[PDB]
Amino acid sequence: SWVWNQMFVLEEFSGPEPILVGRLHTDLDPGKIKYILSGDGAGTIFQINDITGDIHAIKRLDREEKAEYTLTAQAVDFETNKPLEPPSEFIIKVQD
Amino acid sequence: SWVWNQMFVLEEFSGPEPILVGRLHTDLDKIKYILSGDGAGTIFQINDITGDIHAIKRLDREEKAEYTLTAQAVDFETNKPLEPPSEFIIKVQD
């Protein structure tokens, strides 16, 4: 019952310069995973790379405006777009 | 399955002033959070009440890129485990 699916971003260090928040990652193996990000500020505030799974904040964050972002993680096969993981919620929580 | 038990810390923002890394949390309803392993206490410091992990030294990814730690949750009175002891990883920047 450990809860691991949250990430924290320090608002002070956020801005137009992208800052690494976390990474989507599956323990699933070879045989390539495409990482898809949706929900609360996906694309605009938080940007994913579909290959690496890296999530960067690409905007200044303001905890007083919004303190928590609920996002959905997805993983699909590059060729067929068939799911390789269940769509799964995780939370990005903003700093101070 | 999704792997969530990793926390990333940016080396550039580390130093003598503590920066928040992440937080140990159990979905139980009281809980004492205990941290052990790679740099527990010296580099990474936990608040046993809130579960907050701070980095309290300048990190250096060239020296050590990755820290394997153990999360524990115990009862304040009896110190018996409320969760099984679980590994997690703090990864440092670039």
mmCIF file with all atom_site columns, C-alpha atoms in Angstrom:
data_model
loop_
_atom_site.group_PDB
_atom_site.id
_atom_site.type_symbol
_atom_site.label_atom_id
_atom_site.label_alt_id
_atom_site.label_comp_id
_atom_site.label_asym_id
_atom_site.label_entity_id
_atom_site.label_seq_id
_atom_site.pdbx_PDB_ins_code
_atom_site.Cartn_x
_atom_site.Cartn_y
_atom_site.Cartn_z
_atom_site.occupancy
_atom_site.B_iso_or_equiv
_atom_site.pdbx_formal_charge
_atom_site.auth_seq_id
_atom_site.auth_comp_id
_atom_site.auth_asym_id
_atom_site.auth_atom_id
_atom_site.pdbx_PDB_model_num
ATOM 1   C CA . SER A 1 1  ? 0.000  0.000  0.000   1.00 0.00 ? 1  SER A CA 1
ATOM 2   C CA . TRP A 1 2  ? 2.939  2.287  -0.696  1.00 0.00 ? 2  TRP A CA 1
ATOM 3   C CA . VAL A 1 3  ? 1.766  5.085  -2.980  1.00 0.00 ? 3  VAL A CA 1
ATOM 4   C CA . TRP A 1 4  ? 4.395  5.900  -5.623  1.00 0.00 ? 4  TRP A CA 1
ATOM 5   C CA . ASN A 1 5  ? 2.465  7.553  -8.504  1.00 0.00 ? 5  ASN A CA 1
ATOM 6   C CA . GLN A 1 6  ? 3.117  11.225 -7.632  1.00 0.00 ? 6  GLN A CA 1
ATOM 7   C CA . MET A 1 7  ? 5.813  13.621 -8.828  1.00 0.00 ? 7  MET A CA 1
ATOM 8   C CA . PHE A 1 8  ? 6.916  16.902 -7.366  1.00 0.00 ? 8  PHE A CA 1
ATOM 9   C CA . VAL A 1 9  ? 8.043  20.043 -9.221  1.00 0.00 ? 9  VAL A CA 1
ATOM 10  C CA . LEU A 1 10 ? 9.803  22.944 -7.593  1.00 0.00 ? 10 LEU A CA 1
ATOM 11  C CA . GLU A 1 11 ? 7.911  26.089 -8.761  1.00 0.00 ? 11 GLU A CA 1
ATOM 12  C CA . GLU A 1 12 ? 10.902 28.408 -8.181  1.00 0.00 ? 12 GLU A CA 1
ATOM 13  C CA . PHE A 1 13 ? 12.981 26.563 -10.801 1.00 0.00 ? 13 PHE A CA 1
ATOM 14  C CA . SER A 1 14 ? 10.148 26.432 -13.408 1.00 0.00 ? 14 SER A CA 1
ATOM 15  C CA . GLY A 1 15 ? 9.835  28.749 -16.440 1.00 0.00 ? 15 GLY A CA 1
ATOM 16  C CA . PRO A 1 16 ? 10.269 28.648 -20.218 1.00 0.00 ? 16 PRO A CA 1
ATOM 17  C CA . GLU A 1 17 ? 13.418 26.547 -19.666 1.00 0.00 ? 17 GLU A CA 1
ATOM 18  C CA . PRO A 1 18 ? 12.221 22.919 -19.468 1.00 0.00 ? 18 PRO A CA 1
ATOM 19  C CA . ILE A 1 19 ? 12.773 21.243 -16.125 1.00 0.00 ? 19 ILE A CA 1
ATOM 20  C CA . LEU A 1 20 ? 12.593 17.446 -15.683 1.00 0.00 ? 20 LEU A CA 1
ATOM 21  C CA . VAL A 1 21 ? 9.630  16.370 -13.547 1.00 0.00 ? 21 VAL A CA 1
ATOM 22  C CA . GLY A 1 22 ? 9.751  12.596 -13.914 1.00 0.00 ? 22 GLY A CA 1
ATOM 23  C CA . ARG A 1 23 ? 9.493  9.832  -16.493 1.00 0.00 ? 23 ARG A CA 1
ATOM 24  C CA . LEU A 1 24 ? 6.819  7.359  -17.531 1.00 0.00 ? 24 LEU A CA 1
ATOM 25  C CA . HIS A 1 25 ? 8.264  3.890  -17.546 1.00 0.00 ? 25 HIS A CA 1
ATOM 26  C CA . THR A 1 26 ? 7.012  0.312  -17.873 1.00 0.00 ? 26 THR A CA 1
ATOM 27  C CA . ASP A 1 27 ? 8.972  -2.753 -16.787 1.00 0.00 ? 27 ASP A CA 1
ATOM 28  C CA . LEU A 1 28 ? 7.750  -4.430 -20.026 1.00 0.00 ? 28 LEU A CA 1
ATOM 29  C CA . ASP A 1 29 ? 10.461 -5.766 -22.350 1.00 0.00 ? 29 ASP A CA 1
ATOM 30  C CA . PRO A 1 30 ? 11.857 -5.872 -26.011 1.00 0.00 ? 30 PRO A CA 1
ATOM 31  C CA . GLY A 1 31 ? 10.421 -7.908 -28.914 1.00 0.00 ? 31 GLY A CA 1
ATOM 32  C CA . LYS A 1 32 ? 9.339  -0.425 -28.596 1.00 0.00 ? 32 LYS A CA 1
ATOM 33  C CA . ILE A 1 33 ? 6.967  1.336  -26.187 1.00 0.00 ? 33 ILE A CA 1
ATOM 34  C CA . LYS A 1 34 ? 5.306  4.641  -27.135 1.00 0.00 ? 34 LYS A CA 1
ATOM 35  C CA . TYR A 1 35 ? 4.539  6.824  -24.082 1.00 0.00 ? 35 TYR A CA 1
ATOM 36  C CA . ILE A 1 36 ? 1.414  8.975  -24.252 1.00 0.00 ? 36 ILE A CA 1
ATOM 37  C CA . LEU A 1 37 ? 0.447  11.727 -21.798 1.00 0.00 ? 37 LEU A CA 1
ATOM 38  C CA . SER A 1 38 ? -3.030 13.213 -21.270 1.00 0.00 ? 38 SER A CA 1
ATOM 39  C CA . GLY A 1 39 ? -5.073 15.274 -18.742 1.00 0.00 ? 39 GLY A CA 1
ATOM 40  C CA . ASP A 1 40 ? -4.325 18.317 -16.529 1.00 0.00 ? 40 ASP A CA 1
ATOM 41  C CA . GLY A 1 41 ? -1.998 20.542 -18.594 1.00 0.00 ? 41 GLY A CA 1
ATOM 42  C CA . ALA A 1 42 ? -0.647 17.746 -20.812 1.00 0.00 ? 42 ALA A CA 1
ATOM 43  C CA . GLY A 1 43 ? 1.238  19.169 -23.782 1.00 0.00 ? 43 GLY A CA 1
ATOM 44  C CA . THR A 1 44 ? 0.991  22.840 -22.737 1.00 0.00 ? 44 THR A CA 1
ATOM 45  C CA . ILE A 1 45 ? 2.455  22.834 -19.227 1.00 0.00 ? 45 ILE A CA 1
ATOM 46  C CA . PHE A 1 46 ? 3.875  19.331 -19.082 1.00 0.00 ? 46 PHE A CA 1
ATOM 47  C CA . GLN A 1 47 ? 5.522  17.850 -22.181 1.00 0.00 ? 47 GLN A CA 1
ATOM 48  C CA . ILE A 1 48 ? 6.388  14.203 -22.725 1.00 0.00 ? 48 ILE A CA 1
ATOM 49  C CA . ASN A 1 49 ? 8.787  12.608 -25.101 1.00 0.00 ? 49 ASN A CA 1
ATOM 50  C CA . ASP A 1 50 ? 7.039  9.550  -26.583 1.00 0.00 ? 50 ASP A CA 1
ATOM 51  C CA . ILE A 1 51 ? 10.333 7.593  -26.825 1.00 0.00 ? 51 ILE A CA 1
ATOM 52  C CA . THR A 1 52 ? 12.119 8.336  -23.541 1.00 0.00 ? 52 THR A CA 1
ATOM 53  C CA . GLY A 1 53 ? 9.041  8.887  -21.412 1.00 0.00 ? 53 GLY A CA 1
ATOM 54  C CA . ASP A 1 54 ? 10.629 12.035 -19.918 1.00 0.00 ? 54 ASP A CA 1
ATOM 55  C CA . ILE A 1 55 ? 8.154  14.622 -18.583 1.00 0.00 ? 55 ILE A CA 1
ATOM 56  C CA . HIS A 1 56 ? 9.331  18.245 -18.541 1.00 0.00 ? 56 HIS A CA 1
ATOM 57  C CA . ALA A 1 57 ? 7.564  21.275 -17.192 1.00 0.00 ? 57 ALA A CA 1
ATOM 58  C CA . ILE A 1 58 ? 7.787  23.884 -19.983 1.00 0.00 ? 58 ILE A CA 1
ATOM 59  C CA . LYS A 1 59 ? 5.927  26.822 -18.325 1.00 0.00 ? 59 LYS A CA 1
ATOM 60  C CA . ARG A 1 60 ? 6.277  28.751 -15.076 1.00 0.00 ? 60 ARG A CA 1
ATOM 61  C CA . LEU A 1 61 ? 4.136  27.009 -12.452 1.00 0.00 ? 61 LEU A CA 1
ATOM 62  C CA . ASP A 1 62 ? 2.040  28.744 -9.857  1.00 0.00 ? 62 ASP A CA 1
ATOM 63  C CA . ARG A 1 63 ? 0.899  26.664 -6.887  1.00 0.00 ? 63 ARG A CA 1
ATOM 64  C CA . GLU A 1 64 ? -1.661 29.317 -5.906  1.00 0.00 ? 64 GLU A CA 1
ATOM 65  C CA . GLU A 1 65 ? -3.300 29.012 -9.369  1.00 0.00 ? 65 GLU A CA 1
ATOM 66  C CA . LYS A 1 66 ? -3.145 25.170 -9.410  1.00 0.00 ? 66 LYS A CA 1
ATOM 67  C CA . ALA A 1 67 ? -1.363 23.009 -6.845  1.00 0.00 ? 67 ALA A CA 1
ATOM 68  C CA . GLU A 1 68 ? -1.943 19.498 -8.256  1.00 0.00 ? 68 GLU A CA 1
ATOM 69  C CA . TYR A 1 69 ? -2.191 18.141 -11.777 1.00 0.00 ? 69 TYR A CA 1
ATOM 70  C CA . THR A 1 70 ? -3.868 14.780 -12.313 1.00 0.00 ? 70 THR A CA 1
ATOM 71  C CA . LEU A 1 71 ? -2.495 13.210 -15.495 1.00 0.00 ? 71 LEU A CA 1
ATOM 72  C CA . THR A 1 72 ? -2.991 9.919  -17.290 1.00 0.00 ? 72 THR A CA 1
ATOM 73  C CA . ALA A 1 73 ? -0.129 7.724  -18.437 1.00 0.00 ? 73 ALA A CA 1
ATOM 74  C CA . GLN A 1 74 ? -0.519 5.534  -21.517 1.00 0.00 ? 74 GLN A CA 1
ATOM 75  C CA . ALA A 1 75 ? 1.802  3.113  -23.304 1.00 0.00 ? 75 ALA A CA 1
ATOM 76  C CA . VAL A 1 76 ? 1.135  1.814  -26.817 1.00 0.00 ? 76 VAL A CA 1
ATOM 77  C CA . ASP A 1 77 ? 2.816  -0.142 -29.598 1.00 0.00 ? 77 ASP A CA 1
ATOM 78  C CA . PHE A 1 78 ? 4.316  2.249  -32.142 1.00 0.00 ? 78 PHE A CA 1
ATOM 79  C CA . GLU A 1 79 ? 2.939  0.243  -35.080 1.00 0.00 ? 79 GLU A CA 1
ATOM 80  C CA . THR A 1 80 ? -0.589 -0.811 -34.066 1.00 0.00 ? 80 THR A CA 1
ATOM 81  C CA . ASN A 1 81 ? -1.331 1.748  -31.339 1.00 0.00 ? 81 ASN A CA 1
ATOM 82  C CA . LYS A 1 82 ? -2.610 -1.212 -29.238 1.00 0.00 ? 82 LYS A CA 1
ATOM 83  C CA . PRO A 1 83 ? -2.271 -0.608 -25.447 1.00 0.00 ? 83 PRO A CA 1
ATOM 84  C CA . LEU A 1 84 ? 0.706  -2.162 -23.683 1.00 0.00 ? 84 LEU A CA 1
ATOM 85  C CA . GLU A 1 85 ? -0.367 -0.885 -20.229 1.00 0.00 ? 85 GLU A CA 1
ATOM 86  C CA . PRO A 1 86 ? -3.668 0.137  -18.628 1.00 0.00 ? 86 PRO A CA 1
ATOM 87  C CA . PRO A 1 87 ? -4.277 3.906  -18.761 1.00 0.00 ? 87 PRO A CA 1
ATOM 88  C CA . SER A 1 88 ? -3.182 5.017  -15.307 1.00 0.00 ? 88 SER A CA 1
ATOM 89  C CA . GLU A 1 89 ? -3.594 8.214  -13.318 1.00 0.00 ? 89 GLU A CA 1
ATOM 90  C CA . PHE A 1 90 ? -0.685 9.897  -11.567 1.00 0.00 ? 90 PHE A CA 1
ATOM 91  C CA . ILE A 1 91 ? -0.334 13.269 -9.868  1.00 0.00 ? 91 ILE A CA 1
ATOM 92  C CA . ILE A 1 92 ? 2.155  16.110 -10.376 1.00 0.00 ? 92 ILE A CA 1
ATOM 93  C CA . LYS A 1 93 ? 2.251  18.201 -7.179  1.00 0.00 ? 93 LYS A CA 1
ATOM 94  C CA . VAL A 1 94 ? 3.592  21.732 -7.173  1.00 0.00 ? 94 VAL A CA 1
ATOM 95  C CA . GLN A 1 95 ? 6.312  22.988 -4.769  1.00 0.00 ? 95 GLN A CA 1
ATOM 96  C CA . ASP A 1 96 ? 6.330  25.389 -1.949  1.00 0.00 ? 96 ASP A CA 1
ATOM 97  C CA . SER B 2 1  ? 3.316  -2.712 -15.474 1.00 0.00 ? 1  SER B CA 1
ATOM 98  C CA . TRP B 2 2  ? 3.963  0.976  -14.669 1.00 0.00 ? 2  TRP B CA 1
ATOM 99  C CA . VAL B 2 3  ? 7.088  1.705  -12.619 1.00 0.00 ? 3  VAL B CA 1
ATOM 100 C CA . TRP B 2 4  ? 6.465  4.625  -10.218 1.00 0.00 ? 4  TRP B CA 1
ATOM 101 C CA . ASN B 2 5  ? 8.959  3.995  -7.390  1.00 0.00 ? 5  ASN B CA 1
ATOM 102 C CA . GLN B 2 6  ? 11.637 6.341  -8.777  1.00 0.00 ? 6  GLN B CA 1
ATOM 103 C CA . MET B 2 7  ? 12.220 9.967  -7.938  1.00 0.00 ? 7  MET B CA 1
ATOM 104 C CA . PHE B 2 8  ? 14.291 12.394 -9.938  1.00 0.00 ? 8  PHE B CA 1
ATOM 105 C CA . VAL B 2 9  ? 16.359 15.223 -8.407  1.00 0.00 ? 9  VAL B CA 1
ATOM 106 C CA . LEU B 2 10 ? 18.068 17.993 -10.335 1.00 0.00 ? 10 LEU B CA 1
ATOM 107 C CA . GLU B 2 11 ? 21.728 18.272 -9.279  1.00 0.00 ? 11 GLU B CA 1
ATOM 108 C CA . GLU B 2 12 ? 21.939 21.941 -10.360 1.00 0.00 ? 12 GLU B CA 1
ATOM 109 C CA . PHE B 2 13 ? 19.362 23.018 -7.766  1.00 0.00 ? 13 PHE B CA 1
ATOM 110 C CA . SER B 2 14 ? 20.966 20.983 -4.916  1.00 0.00 ? 14 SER B CA 1
ATOM 111 C CA . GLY B 2 15 ? 23.316 22.346 -2.227  1.00 0.00 ? 15 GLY B CA 1
ATOM 112 C CA . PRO B 2 16 ? 23.274 23.273 1.484   1.00 0.00 ? 16 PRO B CA 1
ATOM 113 C CA . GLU B 2 17 ? 19.690 24.579 1.183   1.00 0.00 ? 17 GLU B CA 1
ATOM 114 C CA . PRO B 2 18 ? 17.378 21.518 1.217   1.00 0.00 ? 18 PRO B CA 1
ATOM 115 C CA . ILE B 2 19 ? 15.313 20.770 -1.877  1.00 0.00 ? 19 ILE B CA 1
ATOM 116 C CA . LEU B 2 20 ? 12.277 18.478 -1.911  1.00 0.00 ? 20 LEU B CA 1
ATOM 117 C CA . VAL B 2 21 ? 12.881 15.143 -3.694  1.00 0.00 ? 21 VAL B CA 1
ATOM 118 C CA . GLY B 2 22 ? 9.648  13.267 -3.101  1.00 0.00 ? 22 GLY B CA 1
ATOM 119 C CA . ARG B 2 23 ? 7.584  11.795 -0.301  1.00 0.00 ? 23 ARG B CA 1
ATOM 120 C CA . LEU B 2 24 ? 7.004  8.393  1.249   1.00 0.00 ? 24 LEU B CA 1
ATOM 121 C CA . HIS B 2 25 ? 3.287  7.705  1.582   1.00 0.00 ? 25 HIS B CA 1
ATOM 122 C CA . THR B 2 26 ? 1.058  4.778  2.399   1.00 0.00 ? 26 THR B CA 1
ATOM 123 C CA . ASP B 2 27 ? -2.670 4.789  1.727   1.00 0.00 ? 27 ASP B CA 1
ATOM 124 C CA . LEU B 2 28 ? -3.441 3.769  5.344   1.00 0.00 ? 28 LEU B CA 1
ATOM 125 C CA . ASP B 2 29 ? -5.212 5.666  8.154   1.00 0.00 ? 29 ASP B CA 1
ATOM 126 C CA . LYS B 2 30 ? -0.147 7.392  13.162  1.00 0.00 ? 30 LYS B CA 1
ATOM 127 C CA . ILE B 2 31 ? 2.339  6.262  10.454  1.00 0.00 ? 31 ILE B CA 1
ATOM 128 C CA . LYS B 2 32 ? 6.077  6.670  11.150  1.00 0.00 ? 32 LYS B CA 1
ATOM 129 C CA . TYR B 2 33 ? 8.191  6.869  7.945   1.00 0.00 ? 33 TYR B CA 1
ATOM 130 C CA . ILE B 2 34 ? 11.675 5.424  8.062   1.00 0.00 ? 34 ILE B CA 1
ATOM 131 C CA . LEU B 2 35 ? 14.390 5.783  5.430   1.00 0.00 ? 35 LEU B CA 1
ATOM 132 C CA . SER B 2 36 ? 17.472 3.597  5.022   1.00 0.00 ? 36 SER B CA 1
ATOM 133 C CA . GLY B 2 37 ? 20.193 2.728  2.469   1.00 0.00 ? 37 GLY B CA 1
ATOM 134 C CA . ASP B 2 38 ? 22.218 4.780  -0.076  1.00 0.00 ? 38 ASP B CA 1
ATOM 135 C CA . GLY B 2 39 ? 22.846 8.167  1.554   1.00 0.00 ? 39 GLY B CA 1
ATOM 136 C CA . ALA B 2 40 ? 19.931 8.079  3.988   1.00 0.00 ? 40 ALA B CA 1
ATOM 137 C CA . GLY B 2 41 ? 20.438 10.728 6.695   1.00 0.00 ? 41 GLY B CA 1
ATOM 138 C CA . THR B 2 42 ? 23.563 12.252 5.150   1.00 0.00 ? 42 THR B CA 1
ATOM 139 C CA . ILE B 2 43 ? 22.506 13.227 1.621   1.00 0.00 ? 43 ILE B CA 1
ATOM 140 C CA . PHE B 2 44 ? 18.791 12.488 1.739   1.00 0.00 ? 44 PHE B CA 1
ATOM 141 C CA . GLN B 2 45 ? 16.828 13.362 4.897   1.00 0.00 ? 45 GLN B CA 1
ATOM 142 C CA . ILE B 2 46 ? 13.297 12.220 5.718   1.00 0.00 ? 46 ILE B CA 1
ATOM 143 C CA . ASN B 2 47 ? 10.712 13.789 8.020   1.00 0.00 ? 47 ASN B CA 1
ATOM 144 C CA . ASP B 2 48 ? 9.321  10.784 9.933   1.00 0.00 ? 48 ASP B CA 1
ATOM 145 C CA . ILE B 2 49 ? 5.885  12.484 10.273  1.00 0.00 ? 49 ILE B CA 1
ATOM 146 C CA . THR B 2 50 ? 5.269  13.982 6.800   1.00 0.00 ? 50 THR B CA 1
ATOM 147 C CA . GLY B 2 51 ? 7.241  11.480 4.759   1.00 0.00 ? 51 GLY B CA 1
ATOM 148 C CA . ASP B 2 52 ? 9.056  14.308 2.897   1.00 0.00 ? 52 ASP B CA 1
ATOM 149 C CA . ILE B 2 53 ? 12.516 13.452 1.513   1.00 0.00 ? 53 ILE B CA 1
ATOM 150 C CA . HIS B 2 54 ? 14.893 16.414 1.043   1.00 0.00 ? 54 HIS B CA 1
ATOM 151 C CA . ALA B 2 55 ? 18.310 16.465 -0.531  1.00 0.00 ? 55 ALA B CA 1
ATOM 152 C CA . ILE B 2 56 ? 20.570 18.265 1.984   1.00 0.00 ? 56 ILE B CA 1
ATOM 153 C CA . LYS B 2 57 ? 23.952 18.169 0.163   1.00 0.00 ? 57 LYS B CA 1
ATOM 154 C CA . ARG B 2 58 ? 25.079 19.198 -3.289  1.00 0.00 ? 58 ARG B CA 1
ATOM 155 C CA . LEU B 2 59 ? 24.622 16.142 -5.527  1.00 0.00 ? 59 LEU B CA 1
ATOM 156 C CA . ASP B 2 60 ? 27.104 15.068 -8.183  1.00 0.00 ? 60 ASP B CA 1
ATOM 157 C CA . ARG B 2 61 ? 25.780 12.687 -10.855 1.00 0.00 ? 61 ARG B CA 1
ATOM 158 C CA . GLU B 2 62 ? 29.346 11.867 -11.988 1.00 0.00 ? 62 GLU B CA 1
ATOM 159 C CA . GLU B 2 63 ? 30.155 10.601 -8.467  1.00 0.00 ? 63 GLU B CA 1
ATOM 160 C CA . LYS B 2 64 ? 26.857 8.711  -7.932  1.00 0.00 ? 64 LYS B CA 1
ATOM 161 C CA . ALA B 2 65 ? 24.015 8.732  -10.509 1.00 0.00 ? 65 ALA B CA 1
ATOM 162 C CA . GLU B 2 66 ? 21.500 6.602  -8.689  1.00 0.00 ? 66 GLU B CA 1
ATOM 163 C CA . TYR B 2 67 ? 20.536 5.883  -5.084  1.00 0.00 ? 67 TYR B CA 1
ATOM 164 C CA . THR B 2 68 ? 18.711 2.699  -4.054  1.00 0.00 ? 68 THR B CA 1
ATOM 165 C CA . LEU B 2 69 ? 16.845 3.322  -0.772  1.00 0.00 ? 69 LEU B CA 1
ATOM 166 C CA . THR B 2 70 ? 14.434 1.382  1.403   1.00 0.00 ? 70 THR B CA 1
ATOM 167 C CA . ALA B 2 71 ? 11.077 2.780  2.497   1.00 0.00 ? 71 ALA B CA 1
ATOM 168 C CA . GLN B 2 72 ? 9.600  1.655  5.808   1.00 0.00 ? 72 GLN B CA 1
ATOM 169 C CA . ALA B 2 73 ? 6.325  2.484  7.581   1.00 0.00 ? 73 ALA B CA 1
ATOM 170 C CA . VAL B 2 74 ? 5.985  1.605  11.250  1.00 0.00 ? 74 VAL B CA 1
ATOM 171 C CA . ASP B 2 75 ? 3.596  2.243  14.146  1.00 0.00 ? 75 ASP B CA 1
ATOM 172 C CA . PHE B 2 76 ? 4.785  5.089  16.413  1.00 0.00 ? 76 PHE B CA 1
ATOM 173 C CA . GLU B 2 77 ? 4.108  3.076  19.588  1.00 0.00 ? 77 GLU B CA 1
ATOM 174 C CA . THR B 2 78 ? 5.090  -0.541 18.845  1.00 0.00 ? 78 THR B CA 1
ATOM 175 C CA . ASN B 2 79 ? 7.487  0.102  15.946  1.00 0.00 ? 79 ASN B CA 1
ATOM 176 C CA . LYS B 2 80 ? 6.011  -2.942 14.175  1.00 0.00 ? 80 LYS B CA 1
ATOM 177 C CA . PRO B 2 81 ? 5.731  -2.705 10.347  1.00 0.00 ? 81 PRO B CA 1
ATOM 178 C CA . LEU B 2 82 ? 2.557  -1.274 8.804   1.00 0.00 ? 82 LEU B CA 1
ATOM 179 C CA . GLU B 2 83 ? 3.902  -1.978 5.282   1.00 0.00 ? 83 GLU B CA 1
ATOM 180 C CA . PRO B 2 84 ? 6.531  -4.402 3.930   1.00 0.00 ? 84 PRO B CA 1
ATOM 181 C CA . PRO B 2 85 ? 9.913  -2.649 3.503   1.00 0.00 ? 85 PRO B CA 1
ATOM 182 C CA . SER B 2 86 ? 10.101 -1.503 -0.132  1.00 0.00 ? 86 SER B CA 1
ATOM 183 C CA . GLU B 2 87 ? 12.944 -0.381 -2.381  1.00 0.00 ? 87 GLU B CA 1
ATOM 184 C CA . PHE B 2 88 ? 12.846 2.817  -4.405  1.00 0.00 ? 88 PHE B CA 1
ATOM 185 C CA . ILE B 2 89 ? 15.355 4.802  -6.491  1.00 0.00 ? 89 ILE B CA 1
ATOM 186 C CA . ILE B 2 90 ? 16.393 8.432  -6.423  1.00 0.00 ? 90 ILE B CA 1
ATOM 187 C CA . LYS B 2 91 ? 17.951 9.409  -9.755  1.00 0.00 ? 91 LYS B CA 1
ATOM 188 C CA . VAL B 2 92 ? 20.146 12.481 -10.197 1.00 0.00 ? 92 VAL B CA 1
ATOM 189 C CA . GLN B 2 93 ? 19.876 14.983 -13.043 1.00 0.00 ? 93 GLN B CA 1
ATOM 190 C CA . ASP B 2 94 ? 22.384 15.898 -15.837 1.00 0.00 ? 94 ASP B CA 1
#
